[PDB]
Design an enzyme around this catalytic site. Structure first.
Site, PDB file in Angstrom:
ATOM      1  N   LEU A 180     -28.366  -5.614  47.772  1.00 16.19           N
ATOM      2  CA  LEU A 180     -29.385  -4.891  46.993  1.00 16.19           C
ATOM      3  C   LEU A 180     -28.819  -3.685  46.220  1.00 16.19           C
ATOM      4  O   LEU A 180     -29.461  -3.161  45.281  1.00 16.19           O
ATOM      5  CB  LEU A 180     -30.540  -4.411  47.903  1.00 16.19           C
ATOM      6  CG  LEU A 180     -31.393  -5.476  48.633  1.00 16.19           C
ATOM      7  CD1 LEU A 180     -32.450  -4.833  49.486  1.00 16.19           C
ATOM      8  CD2 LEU A 180     -32.065  -6.443  47.663  1.00 16.19           C
ATOM      9  N   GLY A 233     -22.809   2.080  46.982  1.00 20.38           N
ATOM     10  CA  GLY A 233     -22.363   3.357  46.440  1.00 20.38           C
ATOM     11  C   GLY A 233     -21.946   4.318  47.529  1.00 20.38           C
ATOM     12  O   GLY A 233     -21.480   3.894  48.599  1.00 20.38           O
ATOM     13  N   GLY A 234     -22.157   5.606  47.263  1.00 18.99           N
ATOM     14  CA  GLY A 234     -21.858   6.689  48.195  1.00 18.99           C
ATOM     15  C   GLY A 234     -22.526   6.554  49.557  1.00 18.99           C
ATOM     16  O   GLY A 234     -22.007   7.052  50.560  1.00 18.99           O
ATOM     17  N   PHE A 235     -23.683   5.863  49.602  1.00 14.90           N
ATOM     18  CA  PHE A 235     -24.478   5.605  50.814  1.00 14.90           C
ATOM     19  C   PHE A 235     -23.955   4.433  51.691  1.00 14.90           C
ATOM     20  O   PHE A 235     -24.355   4.331  52.853  1.00 14.90           O
ATOM     21  CB  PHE A 235     -25.940   5.340  50.428  1.00 14.90           C
ATOM     22  CG  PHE A 235     -26.148   4.243  49.406  1.00 14.90           C
ATOM     23  CD1 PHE A 235     -26.218   4.542  48.045  1.00 14.90           C
ATOM     24  CD2 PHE A 235     -26.325   2.921  49.808  1.00 14.90           C
ATOM     25  CE1 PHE A 235     -26.447   3.540  47.104  1.00 14.90           C
ATOM     26  CE2 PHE A 235     -26.545   1.917  48.867  1.00 14.90           C
ATOM     27  CZ  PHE A 235     -26.602   2.232  47.521  1.00 14.90           C
ATOM     28  N   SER A 293     -23.319   0.001  51.720  1.00 15.98           N
ATOM     29  CA  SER A 293     -23.737  -1.291  51.132  1.00 15.98           C
ATOM     30  C   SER A 293     -25.008  -1.752  51.804  1.00 15.98           C
ATOM     31  O   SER A 293     -25.090  -1.749  53.033  1.00 15.98           O
ATOM     32  CB  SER A 293     -22.654  -2.348  51.290  1.00 15.98           C
ATOM     33  OG  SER A 293     -21.443  -1.906  50.706  1.00 15.98           O
ATOM     34  N   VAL A 294     -26.026  -2.099  51.002  1.00 10.78           N
ATOM     35  CA  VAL A 294     -27.358  -2.483  51.489  1.00 10.78           C
ATOM     36  C   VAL A 294     -27.686  -3.916  51.115  1.00 10.78           C
ATOM     37  O   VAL A 294     -27.676  -4.236  49.930  1.00 10.78           O
ATOM     38  CB  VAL A 294     -28.457  -1.496  51.010  1.00 10.78           C
ATOM     39  CG1 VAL A 294     -29.856  -1.950  51.457  1.00 10.78           C
ATOM     40  CG2 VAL A 294     -28.159  -0.077  51.468  1.00 10.78           C
ATOM     41  N   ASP A 339     -37.404   0.265  42.942  1.00 11.79           N
ATOM     42  CA  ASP A 339     -37.144   1.701  43.075  1.00 11.79           C
ATOM     43  C   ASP A 339     -37.651   2.433  41.826  1.00 11.79           C
ATOM     44  O   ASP A 339     -37.811   1.814  40.760  1.00 11.79           O
ATOM     45  CB  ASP A 339     -35.697   2.083  43.494  1.00 11.79           C
ATOM     46  CG  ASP A 339     -34.539   1.924  42.528  1.00 11.79           C
ATOM     47  OD1 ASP A 339     -34.737   2.122  41.333  1.00 11.79           O
ATOM     48  OD2 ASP A 339     -33.393   1.815  42.996  1.00 11.79           O
ATOM     49  N   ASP A 366     -31.558  14.843  49.000  1.00  8.16           N
ATOM     50  CA  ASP A 366     -31.243  13.972  47.880  1.00  8.16           C
ATOM     51  C   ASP A 366     -32.503  13.328  47.289  1.00  8.16           C
ATOM     52  O   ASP A 366     -32.537  12.127  47.018  1.00  8.16           O
ATOM     53  CB  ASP A 366     -30.152  12.961  48.241  1.00  8.16           C
ATOM     54  CG  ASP A 366     -29.455  12.294  47.053  1.00  8.16           C
ATOM     55  OD1 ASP A 366     -29.499  12.866  45.929  1.00  8.16           O
ATOM     56  OD2 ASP A 366     -28.866  11.209  47.248  1.00  8.16           O
TER      57      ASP A 366
HETATM   58  C1  LIG Z   1     -29.885   0.699  48.013  1.00  9.54           C
HETATM   59  C2  LIG Z   1     -30.904   1.632  47.383  1.00  9.54           C
HETATM   60  C3  LIG Z   1     -30.338   3.017  47.133  1.00  9.54           C
HETATM   61  N1  LIG Z   1     -31.378   1.081  46.080  1.00  9.54           N
HETATM   62  C4  LIG Z   1     -32.154  -0.058  45.865  1.00  9.54           C
HETATM   63  C5  LIG Z   1     -32.347  -0.579  44.578  1.00  9.54           C
HETATM   64  C6  LIG Z   1     -33.172  -1.677  44.386  1.00  9.54           C
HETATM   65  C7  LIG Z   1     -33.821  -2.275  45.474  1.00  9.54           C
HETATM   66  C8  LIG Z   1     -34.769  -3.315  45.665  1.00  9.54           C
HETATM   67  N2  LIG Z   1     -35.148  -3.418  46.922  1.00  9.54           N
HETATM   68  N3  LIG Z   1     -34.451  -2.430  47.611  1.00  9.54           N
HETATM   69  C9  LIG Z   1     -34.806  -2.151  48.967  1.00  9.54           C
HETATM   70  C10 LIG Z   1     -35.939  -2.725  49.556  1.00  9.54           C
HETATM   71  N4  LIG Z   1     -36.328  -2.351  50.785  1.00  9.54           N
HETATM   72  C11 LIG Z   1     -35.612  -1.404  51.416  1.00  9.54           C
HETATM   73  C12 LIG Z   1     -34.489  -0.818  50.810  1.00  9.54           C
HETATM   74  C13 LIG Z   1     -33.739   0.321  51.399  1.00  9.54           C
HETATM   75  C14 LIG Z   1     -34.181   0.955  52.558  1.00  9.54           C
HETATM   76  C15 LIG Z   1     -33.480   2.018  53.104  1.00  9.54           C
HETATM   77  C16 LIG Z   1     -32.313   2.482  52.503  1.00  9.54           C
HETATM   78  C17 LIG Z   1     -31.633   3.700  53.021  1.00  9.54           C
HETATM   79  O1  LIG Z   1     -30.558   4.065  52.390  1.00  9.54           O
HETATM   80  O2  LIG Z   1     -32.126   4.357  53.917  1.00  9.54           O
HETATM   81  C18 LIG Z   1     -31.854   1.837  51.359  1.00  9.54           C
HETATM   82  C19 LIG Z   1     -32.566   0.782  50.811  1.00  9.54           C
HETATM   83  N5  LIG Z   1     -34.079  -1.226  49.597  1.00  9.54           N
HETATM   84  C20 LIG Z   1     -33.616  -1.735  46.761  1.00  9.54           C
HETATM   85  C21 LIG Z   1     -32.778  -0.645  46.963  1.00  9.54           C
END
Ligand SMILES: CC(C)Nc1ccc2cnn(-c3cncc(-c4ccc(C(=O)O)cc4)n3)c2c1
Length: 273
Positions: free
Chosen positions: A12, A15-17, A19-20, A96, A135
């Site tokens: 998804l 970066g700095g955080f 990999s998701v 987002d 942030d």
């Molecule tokens: C990875 C983050 C920063 N950006 C991002 C961009 C687009 C999408 C689309 N879905 N999605 C998503 C959906 N559900 C949960 C999450 C999510 C939940 C928590 C975190 C976290 O860093 O805590 C990061 C991402 N991300 C995205 C995340």
């Protein structure tokens, strides 16, 4: 076993955080986000009410964990030899706020009001739980499109909330206050209000007001889009150069621009469906 419990999907973001990845809990088919954080990249460490040495991010997520849907919920976590794996909630469908604004441009004030109010409630929740996000930005806000509910995400730059000066920062520079830029010092609440001013400008103008350190220090706010006088006043107030001249969360929520906010479901019905 982590690999047993979750079915891994697409990446998804990274970066700095870390990999998701998109995921599914194999037991109940619940949509999840699987976040991998490298141990060598974790500078802030903490301890849980039991005493285990975990990253600060886990400590902070557990402190903010509740039924309140304005902040992302940590469902589980796991330690691996060289990393930590965080299982987080995943709204579906989702977008987002950065992508939303990129796609749709500057937001209608009624929409920005609903979104901004929800962000304020989410940040007040964090502070009540003794957590400073550090942030707050469009990229760290998810929109649950069916419910019109916003979710504050990524506590990887956060800290325990304190009333004394912070002399460390690893959040987004363009959302950072002039006192951090100039003096490498800030207080939690007033720095959070500055970032909220940047976020609100971003919602109603479609872009951030300052790019360079010099622009942040000067703090002269130019509106590139048609924005109401009350909204401009609120933005200019949050973006006061002196931290002590900034409004409190109560003063922001009592501002004339913040009156008659839509319910999240009303927001989804008018603007997201
Ligand atoms: C990875 C983050 C920063 N950006 C991002 C961009 C687009 C999408 C689309 N879905 N999605 C998503 C959906 N559900 C949960 C999450 C999510 C939940 C928590 C975190 C976290 O860093 O805590 C990061 C991402 N991300 C995205 C995340």
């Amino acid at each position: 076993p982590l690999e047993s419990q979750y079915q891994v999907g697409p990446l998804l973001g990274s970066g700095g955080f870390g990999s998701v990845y998109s995921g599914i809990r194999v037991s109940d088919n619940l949509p999840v986000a699987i976040k991998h954080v490298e141990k060598d990249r974790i500078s802030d460490w903490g301890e849980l009410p039991n005493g285990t040495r975990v990253p600060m991010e886990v400590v902070l997520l557990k402190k903010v964990s509740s039924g309140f849907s304005g902040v992302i919920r940590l469902l589980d976590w796991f330690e691996r030899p060289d990393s930590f794996v965080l299982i987080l909630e995943r709204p579906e469908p989702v977008q987002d706020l950065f992508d939303f604004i990129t796609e749709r441009g500057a937001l209608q004030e009624e929409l920005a009001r609903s979104f901004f109010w929800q962000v304020l409630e989410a940040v007040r929740h964090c502070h009540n739980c003794g957590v400073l996000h550090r942030d707050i930005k469009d990229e760290n806000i998810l929109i649950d499109l069916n419910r019109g509910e916003l979710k504050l995400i990524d506590f990887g730059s956060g800290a325990l909330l304190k009333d004394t000066v912070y002399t460390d920062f690893d959040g987004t520079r363009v959302y950072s206050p002039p006192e951090w830029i100039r003096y490498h010092r800030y207080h939690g609440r007033s720095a959070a209000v500055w970032s909220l001013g940047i976020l609100l400008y971003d919602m109603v103008c479609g872009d951030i007001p300052f790019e360079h350190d010099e622009e942040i220090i000067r703090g002269q706010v130019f509106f590139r889009q048609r924005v109401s006088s009350e909204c401009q006043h609120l933005i200019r107030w949050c973006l006061a150069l002196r931290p002590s001249d900034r409004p409190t969360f109560e003063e922001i929520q009592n501002h004339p621009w913040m009156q008659d906010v839509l319910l999240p479901q009303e927001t989804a019905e008018i603007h997201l469906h």
